[PDB]
Amino acid sequence: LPDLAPEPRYAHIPVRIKEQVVGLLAWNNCSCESSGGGLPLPFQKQVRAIDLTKAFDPAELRAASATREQEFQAFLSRSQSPADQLLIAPANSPLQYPLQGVEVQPLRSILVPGLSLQAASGQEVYQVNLTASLGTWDVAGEVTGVTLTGEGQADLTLVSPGLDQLNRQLQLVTYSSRSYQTNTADTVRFSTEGHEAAFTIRIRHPPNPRLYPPGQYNISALVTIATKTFLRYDRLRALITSIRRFYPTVTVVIADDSDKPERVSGPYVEHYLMPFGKGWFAGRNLAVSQVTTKYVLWVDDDFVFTARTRLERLVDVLERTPLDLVGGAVREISGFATTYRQLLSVEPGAPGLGNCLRQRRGFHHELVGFPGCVVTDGVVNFFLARTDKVREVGFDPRLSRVAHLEFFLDGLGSLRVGSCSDVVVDHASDAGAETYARYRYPGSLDESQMAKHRLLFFKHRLQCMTSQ
Amino acid sequence: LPDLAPEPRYAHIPVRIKEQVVGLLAWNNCSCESSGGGLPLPFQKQVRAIDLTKAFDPAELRAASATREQEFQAFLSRSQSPADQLLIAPANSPLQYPLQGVEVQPLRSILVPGLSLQAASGQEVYQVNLTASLGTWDVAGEVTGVTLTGEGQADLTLVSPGLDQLNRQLQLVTYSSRSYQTNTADTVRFSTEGHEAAFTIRIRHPPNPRLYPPGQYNISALVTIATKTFLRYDRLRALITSIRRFYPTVTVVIADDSDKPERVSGPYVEHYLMPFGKGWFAGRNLAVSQVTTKYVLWVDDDFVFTARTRLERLVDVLERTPLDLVGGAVREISGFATTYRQLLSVEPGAPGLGNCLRQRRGFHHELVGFPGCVVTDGVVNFFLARTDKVREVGFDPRLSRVAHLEFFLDGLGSLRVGSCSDVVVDHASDAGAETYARYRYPGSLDESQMAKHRLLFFKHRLQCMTSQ
Ligand SMILES: CC(=O)N[C@H]1[C@@H](OP(=O)(O)OP(=O)(O)OC[C@H]2O[C@@H](n3ccc(=O)[nH]c3=O)[C@H](O)[C@@H]2O)O[C@H](CO)[C@H](O)[C@@H]1O
Ligand SMILES: CC(=O)N[C@H]1[C@@H](OP(=O)(O)OP(=O)(O)OC[C@H]2O[C@@H](n3ccc(=O)[nH]c3=O)[C@H](O)[C@@H]2O)O[C@H](CO)[C@H](O)[C@@H]1O
Ligand SMILES: *[C@@H]1O[C@H](CO)[C@@H](O[C@@H]2O[C@H](CO)[C@@H](O)[C@H](O)[C@H]2NC(C)=O)[C@H](O)[C@H]1NC(C)=O
Ligand SMILES: *[C@@H]1O[C@H](CO)[C@@H](O[C@@H]2O[C@H](CO)[C@@H](O)[C@H](O)[C@H]2NC(C)=O)[C@H](O)[C@H]1NC(C)=O
Ligand SMILES: *[C@@H]1O[C@H](CO)[C@@H](O)[C@H](O)[C@H]1NC(C)=O
Ligand SMILES: *[C@@H]1O[C@H](CO)[C@@H](O)[C@H](O)[C@H]1NC(C)=O
Ligand SMILES: *[C@@H]1O[C@H](CO)[C@@H](O)[C@H](O)[C@H]1NC(C)=O
Ligand SMILES: *[C@@H]1O[C@H](CO)[C@@H](O)[C@H](O)[C@H]1NC(C)=O
Ligand SMILES: [Mn+2]
Ligand SMILES: [Mn+2]
């Protein structure tokens, strides 16, 4: 979409391309390619590409691409605002005006700051026009010697023989929003003879501040532990026992889609029963919907708390930083502990094909002031998070079987993710077991995998992904 | 406080205040006052005030106000961006620069549009500086005759004897984000001799488009019906029977926190069991967390479908308009039908006391192209909505007993609300009944009401509310 074309005005000018800088720009032509096959080499990491288009019959793919384009166009039309338009500030204009940072509530009024005409003195008359589209102009006070035409209308003229009078009058100009919209903007025109300025007034409500009473840290007040279980009651009970060993009154919310659910009860345990096999992320979404505390801790039902599960440290990070989610480390019985720090980026692909997802191990930078903590895009499913941010992102209930990074991908950009290596939880090593493994370990060409590829293709407008 | 008072530069100028316009401005001094007592008058609506500060012991009120202020300051610090700063465009600068609309992904690069120096034809040397704080400048190509100092640094100088060369060079300037943040902005400085311009590059990811597959309108694919029941299985079953009379394969999600839950099942019914008395909005939040369709229809368990519950019309409105939620009408057995169209606004109050909520019956305007439909802030609990918007706003699981407008208040500004009068659902007219009434109908000085006032005081930074 960049042409870097020499316009005819400057086509006489020589330019030598910077090969290195032009490579940094988005060329909307991404693809996903695997590492070669064969035995791996010590300092090479094997990259695997998935073509998501292969999850569809050619007829399915064409229909899906069309519908996905239609739905995306619909989305853009509901999202995009005059505030997103490219405006260029004119040079050598006598018009002084607010460039950004001017906002009014729907159906409310403000004084518009910083309006003035820096014309030269000595003209016979000075005139300025204000034009709006979603509001109307008026003045907080009439300046003696200034003539106003259009008070309470979308177009306002100010005319004055005195320049100082005109400028004083502009300090008193008000904008009022006149029709109700939830979150939009009005691109105003401010003008004088032979000069024109566009600027934008944002028309929106202030955000819901969602403040939590705080009640060092009362963990029971700040934190709810959320989990999802299925046919693994032994693991679940060991988890609850281990939690209570360190945190006796912290509420544990358990979503459960077992066919024949056992009773789980005890002080500060909330058990939710779901239709059999409704699924994984559905149950995670259920569990988080019931959290009343500022923070939620995700734990799997196969976890065990130890003296290393110091939740206070995770709380500390979220209390002291702008992070929304902070992951801990999960230690296998083999002694290895993983923070599963992942980077996720989407790269622009060809128009209509969709974009490319890159997943790779790693993090962005260290978290200043917090040794052993980093900022990254995704973590292991042991994490403390602001409940509201987790619910704003959501665990898509369609992800019924096997999913992990799909949450961090849904939250990408929306969610400020960190990862601390020093808060550590252990991971634990009949009819029920064969059944559990049948749901948890399907074929890789199973309808589950295909469905998830089609879903990720559609939902996030991807064509392909690379895993590394 | 908008500053009205004349600066010493213009203190010599007379201004006559417009009493009418000054009254439109926010003076950060809102209060809540009841209508006069006594018998009401034909064209007057009785306004009643609730003082939320009276929900606290006066000792506790001071602690609450302090900690509420602290939490809000924390909130602001995590929300606010350099993009929200008031920038004033200087008059009479040769600097042309992008005013808004310039955006880059974290750790990505763009050509900066619209940079130029509009100067004299032929001068000695022309020099322009660019300064950034979260990124680095570089050029997509070196223009012959232009000298660059600081390529790949935060500060970049361009210098040229030729003005055309300099301007061509500016068409090739790139900004690269250099540190990772999810959603911020860099306020850059563009400068030349004796001239300075500030402008902001927004650094953020594109939004999650959350597109829904297609798998007239297939109601079963687009819509899930969501409800919450408690000890009223007769009503619930009559609802399900009535739904099936018109919509045989539409999924019904039922959240249930009854003590001894009855079995509810049938084709396309999903029953979720909650701990006894976990509550109302908790169960609404639960029900919505399980919806996999583009839209969710909220119905109470006491509803009955008729030929007038033509869901297709509600779907039509959300398919064809930027609305997020569209309410229908609920008809009492007495024959009266309510759309319960409400307006909600928050008005700024004194710093530290909090703001004032105004609730009044009414709507903003008619929904053009849809007779009998209006745009408003809240509706009766019969509505079709985009599932994702409903979950983004959420039903606060703290509201365990009696709540309605609290949802629309949480969604205020976030949620585009409409109301159609022609889609109509009926509202249906023992040990269990005494118990049901005990939970549904507490005293108005009961701990439930007091708790809700303290919650709304804290959560939304309100001091008081008026209901009309
Ligand atoms: C510590 C960590 O980062 N673990 C992740 C990983 O665990 P693992 O690969 O170790 O798998 P696991 O067997 O521990 O399963 C994790 C969770 O899946 C649940 N389950 C499984 C099958 C089913 O039909 N329904 C259901 O709810 C189960 O009850 C449990 O809480 O991979 C899973 C993929 O599914 C999840 O992303 C886990 O969070
Ligand atoms: C059509 C409409 O706008 N109705 C609203 C109104 O209904 P009503 O005044 O008709 O009251 P209702 O008794 O039907 O209550 C509505 C809902 O409350 C639920 N319930 C009640 C008590 C309890 O402890 N737990 C629980 O879940 C119950 O399952 C039912 O679906 O006022 C309610 C009480 O706040 C809700 O705002 C309703 O949506
Ligand atoms: C930590 O938080 C818990 C949960 O909010 C507090 O427990 C509640 O405290 C209130 C106020 O004293 C009591 O009315 C409730 O009965 C308690 N709820 C339950 C179910 O335990 C607890 O008091 C807090 N602890 C400290 C040290 O402040
Ligand atoms: C929309 O699409 C189709 C056709 O309208 C329907 O889905 C199928 O309906 C048959 C009829 O009972 C079932 O046997 C299939 O298993 C359905 N497939 C599904 C559930 O996708 C249905 O009317 C709508 N689809 C959905 C998603 O409910
Ligand atoms: C993308 O397309 C442009 C068009 O010429 C090309 O210059 C660029 O190198 C391409 N990149 C890839 C990844 O093929
Ligand atoms: C401003 O408005 C006046 C009054 O309509 C109009 O005649 C004029 O062309 C406009 N021009 C300026 C000064 O922007
Ligand atoms: C708010 O302040 C304005 C201006 O200072 C004053 O005229 C007005 O009456 C005040 N209103 C209330 C309710 O205090
Ligand atoms: C431009 O940058 C140089 C960097 O050394 C500095 O000397 C100068 O103050 C800047 N120019 C202006 C006028 O801001
Ligand atoms: Mn496991
Ligand atoms: Mn009712």
UniProtKB/Swiss-Prot annotation, chains A, B:
Pathway: Sphingolipid metabolism
Domain of life: Eukaryota
Disulfide bonds listed in the record: C373-C420
GO biological process, one term: carbohydrate metabolic process
Coiled coil location: none
Catalytic activity: a ganglioside GM3 (d18:1(4E)) + UDP-N-acetyl-alpha-D-galactosamine = a ganglioside GM2 (d18:1(4E)) + UDP + H(+); a ganglioside GM3 + UDP-N-acetyl-alpha-D-galactosamine = a ganglioside GM2 + UDP + H(+); a ganglioside GD3 + UDP-N-acetyl-alpha-D-galactosamine = a ganglioside GD2 + UDP + H(+); a ganglioside GD3 (d18:1(4E)) + UDP-N-acetyl-alpha-D-galactosamine = a ganglioside GD2 (d18:1(4E)) + UDP + H(+)
InterPro entries in UniProt: Glyco_trans_2-like (IPR001173), GM2_synthase (IPR011143), Nucleotide-diphossugar_trans (IPR029044)
Membrane topology: Single-pass type II membrane protein
Localization terms from the record: Golgi apparatus membrane
One Pfam family of this chain: Glycos_transf_2
GO cellular component, as recorded: Golgi apparatus; Golgi membrane; membrane
EC number: 2.4.1.92
Sorted UniProt keywords: Disease variant, Disulfide bond, Glycoprotein, Glycosyltransferase, Golgi apparatus, Hereditary spastic paraplegia, Lipid metabolism, Membrane, Neurodegeneration, Signal-anchor, Sphingolipid metabolism, Transferase, Transmembrane, Transmembrane helix
One example GO MF annotation: (N-acetylneuraminyl)-galactosylglucosylceramide N-acetylgalactosaminyltransferase activity
Primary residence: Golgi
Disease: Spastic paraplegia 26, autosomal recessive: A form of spastic paraplegia, a neurodegenerative disorder characterized by a slow, gradual, progressive weakness and spasticity of the lower limbs. Rate of progression and the severity of symptoms are quite variable. Initial symptoms may include difficulty with balance, weakness and stiffness in the legs, muscle spasms, and dragging the toes when walking. In some forms of the disorder, bladder symptoms (such as incontinence) may appear, or the weakness and stiffness may spread to other parts of the body.
Known function: Involved in the biosynthesis of gangliosides GM2, GD2, GT2 and GA2 from GM3, GD3, GT3 and GA3, respectively.
PANTHER family: BETA-1,4 N-ACETYLGALACTOSAMINYLTRANSFERASE 1, GLYCO_TRANS_2-LIKE DOMAIN-CONTAINING PROTEIN
Subunit structure: Homodimer; disulfide-linked.
Family: Belongs to the glycosyltransferase 2 family.
Protein name per its UniProtKB record: Beta-1,4 N-acetylgalactosaminyltransferase 1
Annotated source species: Homo sapiens
